[PDB]
Design a protein around this ligand. Structure first.
Ligand SMILES: NC(=O)c1ccc[n+]([C@@H]2O[C@H](COP(=O)([O-])OP(=O)(O)OC[C@H]3O[C@@H](n4cnc5c(N)ncnc54)[C@H](OP(=O)(O)O)[C@@H]3O)[C@@H](O)[C@H]2O)c1
Ligand SMILES: NC(=O)c1ccc[n+]([C@@H]2O[C@H](COP(=O)([O-])OP(=O)(O)OC[C@H]3O[C@@H](n4cnc5c(N)ncnc54)[C@H](OP(=O)(O)O)[C@@H]3O)[C@@H](O)[C@H]2O)c1
Ligand SMILES: NC(=O)c1ccc[n+]([C@@H]2O[C@H](COP(=O)([O-])OP(=O)(O)OC[C@H]3O[C@@H](n4cnc5c(N)ncnc54)[C@H](OP(=O)(O)O)[C@@H]3O)[C@@H](O)[C@H]2O)c1
Ligand SMILES: NC(=O)c1ccc[n+]([C@@H]2O[C@H](COP(=O)([O-])OP(=O)(O)OC[C@H]3O[C@@H](n4cnc5c(N)ncnc54)[C@H](OP(=O)(O)O)[C@@H]3O)[C@@H](O)[C@H]2O)c1
Lengths: 247, 248, 247, 235
C-alpha cells in the first residue's frame, strides 16, 4: 500500500485529496496544525470506507515537528511514496504599504519554508540515491502566483510564486532519482480559507470574475493533485497545472 | 451510444496512443489521417477488436473543405462530438531562420496552426451550449518547443507551437461559459516517427541526455495527459498548459 | 551612421520609432505597404530634424517585395544594423467559431511570416558568420500573446504568441553571431489600428481595464523599442518587454 | 531639485554600478550597505568627486527598525525619495534541497524577499499620490534563476527570486493609479573568459545590469510597470 502524507489534510483541498487518495488505494497521513477534530473526521471517513489513515499533528514551519511527523509516518504507516504540500494560509486583505514583518514571516514560513522542509524529508526517504524506490511530490500553489493578488495579499501571491519556482528547481534536481515534483495552481475554490482572511463570501462574489463563472470545488483540485501523484503522470515533472476555471 | 472524440492525426504516434486510450475509457473514436489509411485502419481494427467504436476519416486539416467534410462524416456516422484532440502536426528538416523559405513557413503553419483553428471552429459550433450543444473538451497538442524556441533546428515549428499555446488560452477564455474546456499538452521529446520524418531518426536517443529525467517519453505517456484533460476529472481545468516533458 | 529598417514605419508605433531612432542617430528606412503619403510625412519630419531617411514600399507578406526592399536599403542607405518588425494588422471582432481560413492566412502572413522573412534577410546581412558586424532586431508582439484576446481576435493573439517564441528561438540561434533579438509587448496604445478593425474608441473603452487606467502612446512603445535596439541593452537578448500599463 | 534614489546593497557589484550610473543621470543617491562601510564610502566618494550627491546609509534590510531608520535618514538628509532599487541580496553555498536547513531558508528569504517588501512599503508610503506624494519608481533585482530553478545549486535562492517576480507584478498592479511603477530586472550570470551555458557565451557586467535598472527607473519607461526585464545574454 503506497503511503501519502498530506500537509493541511484536515480541511478543504487537503481533505478532498486525502479522501480521493484513499479511494485510489493510498494509506494517508492526514496532517493538521491544531484542528484535531477535522483531521479525525477525515480519518474516520477513510477508515469507514475500508482505507487506512492516521492523523498526525505538526506545524510545518517547525523543523522538529516536521521531523517528528515523518518519523511517525515511518513507524506507523511505512516509508512514504507521495507528499502533498498543501498546508497554507492567507491573512486579512492588505496593501503592501500595510504589511508587517510579522505577517510576512508567518506567510512565508507556512507556505514556503514548510514546503521545503517537508520536501527535504520526503526526498531523503524517496530518492533512489539513498536506496529509496522513488516517489511523487505535489505542491499546492495558486493562480495568485501568476496574478499577484494586488490590493488583497501580494505577500501570499509572492509565497506562491516561490512555490512555482521551487517546484521547477526541485523537479530538475531529483529527476534522475525516481522522484517527480509538480504543482497545482488552484483558482477560487469553495473552502474555509476565504472566511479565515475575513472574506467569507469571496467564492460567490468573485465567481463573475472567473471565465467559467463559478468557483471550483475542493474535489476538483484533489483530482488534479491525485493524477499528478500517480503513475499515469510518469513523464510529468516540473509541471504547473492550473485548476482555475480559466482564471 | 457514448461520447465521441475526433482525433486529428490519429493514425500514428501520440494520436494513435490517444485513440486507443480514449476508446478504453469509453469514447467512440474518429481516427483522422492525411494519407496513411493502413495505419488508421489498424488503429480502428484494434479499437473494434476490444469492443470499442471507431471510424477512420481522411482529411488534410489545412484544407477547409476537407475539415468540413470530415466533421459532416462524424456527425452522420458517430454523432455529435463531445471531444476534439488537435494532434495533427509536422516538423521539417533542420534549418536556421536565415534558410527558411516562405513555402516552408506556409506548410508549417497551415498544418500545425490553421488546422487546429479550423477543427476547433467546427467543434465549437457543435459543442457550445449557445447552439444547443451539451459542451465538450478540446485538447491542443503543443510542444516544449513553444517555450524553448528550437534554435538552430526549427524556430518556425516552435513558433507555430507558441501560437497554439496562446490560441489555447484565448479560446478557453472565449468559450468558458459555453460548457467547453480548452487545454494543451506540451510534450517534450517523445519516441515517435516524427523525428525521422524531419531527417533526425535518432533524435529521441540523442536528446535524452538533455532531459532532466534522462529519457524520452512514450506516446502512451502523452496520451494519458490528453485523455485526462478531455475527461470529467479535469472539470475545472481550462486554459492550462500541461507539460509532459521529463522536466525539459 | 547605423541603418535601421522599420517595417510599417509610416504610422503609429512604427512612425514614433522611426522619429525616435533618427533622433538617436540612425539613418532610417521607413517601410510602408500603401500609404506613401504617411511614409513621406515621417521621412519629411526626420529630415527636418537633421536625420537621414528613405521611404520604401513593400508588403512584408510578399517575398519578392521583401527582397527588393532590402536591396534598396543596401543600395541607398547601406547595410542595416537594426530591424524593427513592426508591420502588423488586426481584423474585425470575431469569435473563433466565426474565423475563416482567408482571415487566418492574412493575419499570419503579415504578422508572422513577414517578420520571419525580414529577419531572414537581416540575419544574412548582420551575422558575423557572413562577414557582418552584428546587429539588433526588435519584434513587436502584444500583451495579447499572454492574454489571448478572447471574443475579439484569438487569431491575432496567437500570431503574437508565435512572435514571442520566434523571438526566443531566433535570439538563441544567433547569439554568438553579434545579433540580439528581443520583443516589445505593447498593451492598448493610441493608434489607428483599433479603428482599422472597426473599434475606433477602443483605447478609451479599454482604459479602465488597464491598471494605470489609460492607454499608452506610440512614443512610449518607441522608447522601449529603441532602448532594446541600442548598446545600452548589450546583454539583453531573447527578452519580452511589456509596455502595457500593467496589463 | 535632484530626484533621490535609494539603492539597497549599493556598496558593491550591481548596486554600486547602479549608484554610479544613477548619479551620472542626475539622481542624488543613498547607498545602503549592511556592514561594508568602506565599500559604500568608496562609492560615495566616487559620486561626490564626479560632482554628484550621495550618502552612505547602514541598514540590514531584514531588520524593520533599521529599514525605518534608514528611510528617516534619507528623508532628513537627502529628501523624499523618487526611486528605490531593491538590490540587496545573497546566495549561499551550493546545496541540494535535501540538505537545506531552516536557518538557511530564513536568511535567504529575509534578505532577498522580506527586505524588498519592507523597503517597498516605506517607499510606497512616501511616493504614493494617495498620501500626497508625487509618484515614483521601484526596480526589484530578481534573477534568471526565478525561471530556471537553480537545481542542485540553490533552489531556495531561485524560489526567493520567483517570489520577487510575483511581488513585482502584484505590487505594480496594486499602486498603478498612485503614480508608482514597479518593475524587475532578471540578471543572468554577471562577472565580479567564455561562459558556455550562456547563448551569448560570456558573462554580463554590473554596468549592463545597471543600465536596465536605470532605464526602468526613468521617464522613458513611463508605460512600463509590472515588467520582468531579462539581462541574461539569452539564458
Ligand atoms: N481558493 C482556494 O481555496 C485556494 C486558491 C489557491 C490556492 N489554495 C491553496 O490550497 C491549499 C489548501 O487550502 P484550503 O482552501 O483547502 O485551506 P483551508 O480550507 O483553510 O484548510 C487549511 C488546511 O491547512 C492546514 N494548516 C494551516 N497552517 C498549517 C501549518 N502551519 N502546519 C500544518 N498544517 C497547516 C489546516 O489545519 P487545521 O485543520 O489543523 O487548521 C487545514 O488542514 C493551501 O495551500 C492554499 O493556499 C487555495
Ligand atoms: N517528440 C514528439 O513526438 C513531439 C514533441 C512535441 C510535440 N509533438 C506534437 O505531437 C503531435 C503528434 O506528433 P507525433 O510525434 O505523434 O507525430 P507523427 O508520429 O509524425 O504522426 C503524425 C500524425 O499526424 C497526421 N498528419 C500529418 N499531417 C496532417 C494533416 N495535414 N492533416 C491531418 N493529419 C495529419 C499523420 O497522418 P498520416 O498517418 O496519414 O501520416 C499522423 O497521424 C504533433 O502536433 C507534434 O507537433 C510531438
Ligand atoms: N494597441 C496597439 O496599437 C497595439 C498593441 C499591441 C501591439 N501592436 C502592434 O504594434 C504594431 C504597430 O501597430 P500600430 O497600432 O502602430 O499599427 P497602425 O497604426 O495600424 O500602423 C500600421 C503600420 O503598419 C503598416 N503595414 C500594414 N500591413 C503591412 C504590410 N503587409 N507590409 C508592410 N507594412 C504594413 C502600415 O502601412 P501603411 O501606412 O502603408 O498602411 C502602417 O505603417 C503591430 O505589429 C501591432 O500588432 C499594436
Ligand atoms: N551573477 C550575478 O551576480 C547575479 C545573478 C542573478 C541575480 N543577481 C542579483 O543581483 C543583486 C546584486 O548582486 P551582486 O552579485 O551585485 O551582489 P554583491 O556583489 O554580493 O553585493 C551585495 C550587496 O548587498 C548588500 N547586502 C547583503 N546583505 C544585506 C542586508 N541584509 N541588508 C542590506 N544590504 C545587504 C551588501 O552589503 P555589504 O557590501 O555591506 O556586504 C552589498 O552591498 C542581488 O539581488 C543578486 O541576487 C546577481
Amino acid at each position: 500500500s503506497k503511503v501519502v502524507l498530506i500537509t493541511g489534510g484536515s480541511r478543504g483541498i487537503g481533505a478532498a485529496s486525502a479522501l480521493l487518495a484513499a479511494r485510489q488505494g493510498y494509506a494517508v497521513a492526514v496532517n493538521y496544525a491544531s484542528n484535531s477534530a477535522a483531521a479525525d473526521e477525515v480519518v474516520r471517513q477513510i477508515r469507514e470506507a475500508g482505507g487506512q489513515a492516521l492523523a498526525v499533528q505538526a506545524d510545518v514551519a517547525k523543523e522538529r515537528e516536521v521531523l517528528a511527523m515523518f518519523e511517525t509516518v515511518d513507524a506507523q504507516l511505512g516509508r512514504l511514496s507521495a507528499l502533498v504540500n498543501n498546508a497554507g494560509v492567507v491573512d486579512q486583505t492588505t496593501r503592501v504599504d500595510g504589511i508587517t514583518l510579522e505577517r510576512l514571516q508567518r506567510m512565508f514560513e507556512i507556505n514556503v519554508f514548510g514546503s521545503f522542509l517537508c520536501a527535504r524529508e520526503a526526498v531523503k526517504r524517496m530518492s533512489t540515491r539513498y536506496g529509496g524506490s522513488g516517489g511523487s511530490i505535489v505542491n499546492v500553489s495558486s493562480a495568485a502566483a501568476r496574478l499577484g493578488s494586488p490590493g488583497q495579499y501580494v505577500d501570499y501571491a509572492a509565497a506562491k510564486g516561490a512555490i512555482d519556482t521551487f517546484t521547477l528547481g526541485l523537479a530538475k534536481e531529483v529527476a534522475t532519482e525516481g522522484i517527480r515534483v509538480n504543482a497545482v495552481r488552484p483558482g477560487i475554490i469553495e473552502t474555509d480559507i476565504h472566511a479565515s482572511g475575513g472574506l467569507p463570501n469571496r467564492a460567490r462574489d468573485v465567481a463573475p470574475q472567473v471565465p467559467m463563472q463559478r468557483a471550483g470545488t475542493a474535489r476538483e483540485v484533489a483530482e488534479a493533485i491525485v493524477w499528478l501523484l500517480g503513475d499515469q503522470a510518469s513523464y510529468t515533472t516540473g509541471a504547473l497545472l492550473d485548476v482555475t476555471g480559466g482564471r
